[PDB]
Amino acid sequence: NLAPLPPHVPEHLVFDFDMYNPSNLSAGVQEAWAVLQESNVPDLVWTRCNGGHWIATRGQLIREAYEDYRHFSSECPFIPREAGEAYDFIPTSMDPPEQRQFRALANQVVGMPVVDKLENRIQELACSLIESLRPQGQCNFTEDYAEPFPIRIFMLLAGLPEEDIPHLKYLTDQMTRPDGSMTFAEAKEALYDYLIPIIEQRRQKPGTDAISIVANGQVNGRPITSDEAKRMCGLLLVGGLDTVVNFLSFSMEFLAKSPEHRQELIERPERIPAACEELLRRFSLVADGRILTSDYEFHGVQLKKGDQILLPQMLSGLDERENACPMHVDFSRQKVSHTTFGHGSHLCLGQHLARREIIVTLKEWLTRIPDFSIAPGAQIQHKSGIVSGVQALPLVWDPATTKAV
Numbered sequence: 470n471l472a473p474l475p476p477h478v479p480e481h482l483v484f485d486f487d488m489y490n491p492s493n494l495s496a497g498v499q500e501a502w503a504v505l506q507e508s509n510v511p512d513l514v515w516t517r518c519n520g521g522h523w524i525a526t527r528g529q530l531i532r533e534a535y536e537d538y539r540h541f542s543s544e545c546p547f548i549p550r551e552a553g554e555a556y557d558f559i560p561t562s563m564d565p566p567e568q569r570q571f572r573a574l575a576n577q578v579v580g581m582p583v584v585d586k587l588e589n590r591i592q593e594l595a596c597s598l599i600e601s602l603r604p605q606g607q608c609n610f611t612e613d614y615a616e617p618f619p620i621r622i623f624m625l626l627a628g629l630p631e632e633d634i635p636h637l638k639y640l641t642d643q644m645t646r647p648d649g650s651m652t653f654a655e656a657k658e659a660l661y662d663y664l665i666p667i668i669e670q671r672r673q674k675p676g677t678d679a680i681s682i683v684a685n686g687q688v689n690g691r692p693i694t695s696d697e698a699k700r701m702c703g704l705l706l707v708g709g710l711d712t713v714v715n716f717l718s719f720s721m722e723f724l725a726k727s728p729e730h731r732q733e734l735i736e737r738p739e740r741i742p743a744a745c746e747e748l749l750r751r752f753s754l755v756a757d758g759r760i761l762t763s764d765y766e767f768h769g770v771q772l773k774k775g776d777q778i779l780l781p782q783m784l785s786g787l788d789e790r791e792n793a794c795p796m797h798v799d800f801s802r803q804k805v806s807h808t809t810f811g812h813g814s815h816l817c818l819g820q821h822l823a824r825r826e827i828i829v830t831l832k833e834w835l836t837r838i839p840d841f842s843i844a845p846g847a848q849i850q851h852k853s854g855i856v857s858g859v860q861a862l863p864l865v866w867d868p869a870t871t872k873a874v
C-alpha cells in the first residue's frame with residue numbers, strides 16, 4: 470500500500486518503487502532497480518511505498534548526498550522509518566565527528582592487517598569446500614558455498630561457534646530482507662540478547678577474537694562501554710553474515726551463464742582482481758540511506774527535515790552517466806566507477822576482507838571447476854532489500870572436466 474503523498478512532495482516526482490519487492494524483480498534485481506534510470510525518470514523521485522521516502526537515482530546525487538553528512542544524517546539510515554529509528558549499530562548510526570573514533574576501533578578487527586592474518590585459513594576453507602563439491606557434479610551454491618565460506622570465516626574471526634549460524638543468519642536476514650515474522654527492532658533485540666552475555670564474558674576474560682578486541686577497546690583513548698561494544702559487534706555480525714554471502718551468488722550465477730567470461734579468467738588468471746571489481750560494479754547489491762537534518766533544497770527539490778532518502782549504493786555503478794553500457798560485464802573496462810562499498814565517511818570497513826574472499830573464490834573455483842552451468846530448468850529468483858540476494862543457485866557440471874589440485 471501507498472502512504473498518502475505529503476503536501477511538500479510534488480506529484481510529478483512520484484514513482485512508487487518498492488525496494489523490498491520491485492516490480493521488475495523477475496528480470497534480475499539490478500535490472501529491477503535500474504528501471505529508476507529509464508528515460509523520463511528524474512534524478513530524485515518520491516515513492517509512496519514503505520511509508521514514503523525519496524530515492525536518488527543517479528550516481529552524481531548519490532555521491533553528493535553521501536559526502537554531505539550535515540544535511541543527510543546516518544542517524545536513521547534504513548527504510549522503513551521504524552527500522553531506521555531502531556537502527557543503532559556503531560559506527561553506521563553516527564555522523565562525524567563522533568563516528569570516527571569508533572571506525573578506528575572497528576578497523577582493528579576487520580582491517581587489512583587482520584585480513585592478511587586470515588589469508589591462509591581463507592584459502593584452506595575455500596579449497597576444502599570446493600574439493601568436497603568437485604566429484605559430486607552439482608551443488609546448491611547458496612547453501613553449499615556462498616553461505617558457509619564467508620560465514621565460517623567471520624565466526625572464526627569473532628570466536629563464535631558455527632552451530633550458532635542458523636539462528637544468527639535468520640536474525641540478520643530479518644534486518645535486511647524481512648520475511649515479516651520479525652520487525653527490525655525485534656531482530657535487533659534478539660541479536661543483542663545473543664551478544665550481551667558473550668560481551669560481558671570477554672570483558673572479564675579477554676581473548677584475541679574480534680568481540681574481545683572490540684569489547685576491551687579504547688576509543689580516542691577512553692574505554693568503550695558495554696553498550697557501545699554491543700552496538701559495534703552487532704554490526705560486524707550483520708556485515709559478516711549478509712554481504713559477501715549474497716554477492717558470491719550473483720557473481721557465480723553470472724559465471725555459470727557466461728562461458729566466455731569464465732574462459733577469459735581461465736586463460737588469463739592475472740585478470741581476476743580486475744574481474745572482481747567489474748563484478749562488484751555490475752552486481753552491486755546494497756541500498757541504504759540517510760535522514761534530512763533540516764529543510765534543504767537539493768537539485769531543485771525541496772526536502773523537509775525528517776524526510777528519509779534512499780541513496781542506493783547499487784545504482785551509482787549502473788548509471789550510464791558513470792559507465793557506458795553499464796549492464797555489460799567487461800573485465801577490461803578502463804575506469805570502473807562504482808559506490809558498491811559506499812561513499813564518504815562510512816566507506817565499508819570490511820572491503821579488504823570482502824575482496825579477498827571474492828578473489829580467493831574466483832581463483833580456487835575456476836581452477837578446480839572451470840566448466841559449470843545452471844541446473845537445467847532452474848528459474849533463478851532474486852530477492853530485494855537493504856542487501857539484495859539470490860534465493861537459490863543450483864549448479865551442475867561433469868566431474869570428468871574438473872581438476873584436483
Ligand code: HEM
Binds near residue numbers: 755
Ligand atoms: C560485498 C561485500 C560488502 C559490501 C557490498 C558492503 C557494503 C557496505 C556499504 C555500502 C557500507 C556503507 C553503508 C552506509 O554508508 O550506510 C558499508 C559499511 C560497513 N561495512 Fe561493509 N560491505 C561488504 C562487506 C563487509 C564485511 C565482510 C564486513 C565485516 C564483517 C563489513 C563491515 C562494514 C562495517 C563495520 C561498516 C560501517 C562503517 C561505518 O559506518 O563507518 N562489510 N559496507
Ligand SMILES: CC1(C)[C@@H]2CC[C@@]1(C)C(=O)C2
Binds near residue numbers: 755
Ligand atoms: C548497509 C550494510 C551493508 C552496512 C554493513 C552491513 C549493512 C546491512 C549495514 O547496516 C551497514
Ligand SMILES: [K+]
Binds near residue numbers: 544545556557
Ligand atoms: K536510529
